[PDB]
Amino acid sequence: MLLSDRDLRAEISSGRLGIDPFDDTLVQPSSIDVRLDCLFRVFNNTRYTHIDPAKQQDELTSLVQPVDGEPFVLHPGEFVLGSTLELFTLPDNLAGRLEGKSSLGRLGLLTHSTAGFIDPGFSGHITLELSNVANLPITLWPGMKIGQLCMLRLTSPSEHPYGSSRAGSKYQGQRGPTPSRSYQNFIRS
Amino acid sequence: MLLSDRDLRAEISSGRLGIDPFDDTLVQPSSIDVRLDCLFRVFNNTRYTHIDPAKQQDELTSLVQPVDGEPFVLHPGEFVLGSTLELFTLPDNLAGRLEGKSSLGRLGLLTHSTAGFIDPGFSGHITLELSNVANLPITLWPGMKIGQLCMLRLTSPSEHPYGSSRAGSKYQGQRGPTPSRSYQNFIRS
Amino acid sequence: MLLSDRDLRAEISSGRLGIDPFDDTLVQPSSIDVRLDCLFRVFNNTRYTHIDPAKQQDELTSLVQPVDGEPFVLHPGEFVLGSTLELFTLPDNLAGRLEGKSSLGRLGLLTHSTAGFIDPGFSGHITLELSNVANLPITLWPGMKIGQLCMLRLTSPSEHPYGSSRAGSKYQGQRGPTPSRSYQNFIRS
Ligand SMILES: Cc1cn([C@H]2C[C@H](O)[C@@H](COP(=O)(O)OP(=O)(O)OP(=O)(O)O)O2)c(=O)[nH]c1=O
Ligand SMILES: Cc1cn([C@H]2C[C@H](O)[C@@H](COP(=O)(O)OP(=O)(O)OP(=O)(O)O)O2)c(=O)[nH]c1=O
Ligand SMILES: Cc1cn([C@H]2C[C@H](O)[C@@H](COP(=O)(O)OP(=O)(O)OP(=O)(O)O)O2)c(=O)[nH]c1=O
Ligand SMILES: [Mg+2]
Ligand SMILES: [Mg+2]
Ligand SMILES: [Mg+2]
């Protein structure tokens, strides 16, 4: 059960769903278009021998912000982390999906959102996994529409929503593209 | 709320959901398998210095149609745009997802559908974002099953469905893999 | 309509949804975290000239199992098939999605799940399509959390669920990352 434009608007006007800033001209038949922030993480480390999800490696990426008025250039075959300009606050009874946009995929710009869902209870900017699969670099402009948020009704309110100690959540409140915290509570056999 | 095979069939027999041509043998437990068209766009431009989503660049891709009876060869590490053989027409109260198929991913053929959803009100062929992540070229045969359409019920009918001036839709009615129109209404900060 | 943690737990305690082994500490606001098996398929064939989805090519991949206590190393720009440690059994009235996890995408580990949905009626381990889009190899540990299962309610029970002869299903009961069976019932124009 995916929220139509009208119901998305109702969740926003009722204050159940926070989107800051909210621009109503971005609402779409079945989603709301979202915008790109000015914060990027590039994989440009030159000391580590490998990535180990069980280990903390905060230096794996560098935080990069382009000069005001300039794009970040995503190179062919490159993957970076970006972030939404908007801060989202979800209630305990909706879950979102942060998808890409067809216009952007037609240019070879892919938003992966590998994890699929934004969890009930989540509040923060959303970290975007961005790939360029074209043969040419792509100028990414801070502020451009980069994807769309779709909301699904939960069957019932989540018992221990994102942010709760019991969920063990890692990214509640994030203001940028937080480096991975997979090493926390990491398990292996 | 995802439509079962029976309910998909009901939406089709009632005329609420158009799929042209419709082959009932393609309906699946929870989706309908879809087929590949004979139209492909390759990234083979040799004049542009880069991609700028704010700019119109219709020559970024070339339209390629294989000789009747022959496959299009998707090379390792290559991304192209393809298209569904079927033309889909959605009502204002369903949204679809055009996913890949597990058999094809097991060979390294990935349908990205980065944008996720086919919008309430959308009518046209669906443009497929296709990658080969194997070590070998893959022969793509026009007419083969290439993915599957899953339908979700909307919470309520969409107020301004895809195709409406208010939605500002770019691809209503597309018969092939339309080049990107991201430059239209493009915004940036 | 996506199942909350509580409703996921109800489907499990009622015996409608099988997850073997089930670890309740893995349930999340809107999904259940899943774990990686010790079975991997690498694309390391050196005889075939190309991939043809219409043809049987069982030797396209090699099955690889790391030494107990050691990781499988996924190299930059590499795609392999992995598998869930858990065996899932779905009823005829739910469909699942096997997504990645944000912690893992922040390291450049992408679970594609190109096909999106686990079908009503499906029973088996789930085959994971894994890419490394970082600049560094990633040690994948058997037993680590690798993704999350989200469940959606179907509109109604599926008439011919996965596994039925009428659905023509290829992978019912799979215990590992089964090589592709796209050649079965393969169609082309
Ligand atoms: C997901 C997807 C959608 N589509 C179609 C169906 C969607 O309803 C339509 C628009 O998808 P959108 O993701 O909304 O594309 P867009 O926002 O960049 O462009 P627009 O202004 O037109 O909204 O494109 C494809 O052709 N291929 C795809 O992979
Ligand atoms: C999405 C996905 C599904 N599966 C399982 C669960 C699905 O119900 C089952 C079939 O997925 P499908 O995408 O329907 O695969 P298929 O159409 O190519 O093959 P089939 O004829 O059997 O339908 O495979 C995986 O193992 N890995 C995955 O990533
Ligand atoms: C899908 C996605 C989620 N998120 C946010 C919203 C999710 O509710 C939150 C967690 O996503 P998860 O996929 O649940 O991440 P995780 O399991 O690795 O970490 P955690 O222990 O915190 O659950 O991250 C992004 O920032 N970017 C994304 O692409
Ligand atoms: Mg749109
Ligand atoms: Mg199938
Ligand atoms: Mg999580």
Nearest CA to ligand 3 atom 7: A118
User: Which chain B residue has the Cα nearest residue C52?
Assistant: B139
Beta strands in chain B (DSSP E): 18-20, 27-28, 31-35, 40-42, 62-64, 72-74, 79-83, 87-89, 94-99, 109-111, 117-118, 123-124, 127-132, 138-140, 145-153
Q: Give yes or no for a contact between B96 and C67, defined as CB atoms under 8 angstroms apart.
A: no
The whole-angstrom separation of Cα A141 and Cα A155 is 38
**Is B156 within 8 Å of A7 when comparing Cβ atoms?**
yes
**A146 C-beta closer than 6 A to ligand 3:** no
Asked if B4 lies within 8 A of C187 by C-beta distance, the reply is no
SS3 assignment, position C17: coil
Question: Is any Cβ of chain C less than 8 angstroms from the Cβ of A175?
Answer: no
Asked if the Cβ–Cβ distance from C101 to A182 is below 8 Å, we say: yes
- Which residue range(s) make up the domain with C128? 1-189
Chain-chain contact of B117 with A73 (C-beta, under 8 angstroms): no
Taking the Cβ of residue B173 and every Cβ of chain A, the question of whether any pair is shorter than 8 Å is answered with no
A37, A84 in Cβ contact below 8 A?
Answer: yes
Question: Among partner residues A38, A85, A97, which is closest to B116 by beta-carbon distance?
Answer: A97
CA–CA separation, B79 vs B99, rounded Å?
Answer: 16
Among A1, A4, A25, which would you mutate to test the B interface (most chain B Cβ atoms within 10 Å of its Cβ)?
Answer: A4
User: Given strand C87-89, what is the order of strands in its sheet?
Assistant: C18-20, C87-89, C123-124
Binding residues of C for dCTP: 101-106, 119, 127-129, 148, 162, 170, 174
> Which residues of chain A neighbour C5 with C-beta distances below 8 Å?
158-160
The residue whose C-alpha atom lies closest to atom 6 belonging to ligand 3 is: A118
- Structure determined by: X-ray
- Does C112 lie at the interface with A, CB-CB under 8 angstroms? yes
Alpha-carbon span A64 to B176, nearest angstrom: 38
* β B94-99/B117-118 pair status: antiparallel
DSSP B25: G
In the sheet with A123-124, reading across from the earlier edge strand, the strands are A18-20, A87-89, A123-124
- State how many domains chain A has: 1
Contacts of B71 (CB under 8 A, 6+ apart): B139, B140, B141, B142, C52
What separation in angstroms does the CA of C179 have from each of A179, C60, C167?
35, 8, 19
What's the CATH code of the domain at C65? 2.70.40.10
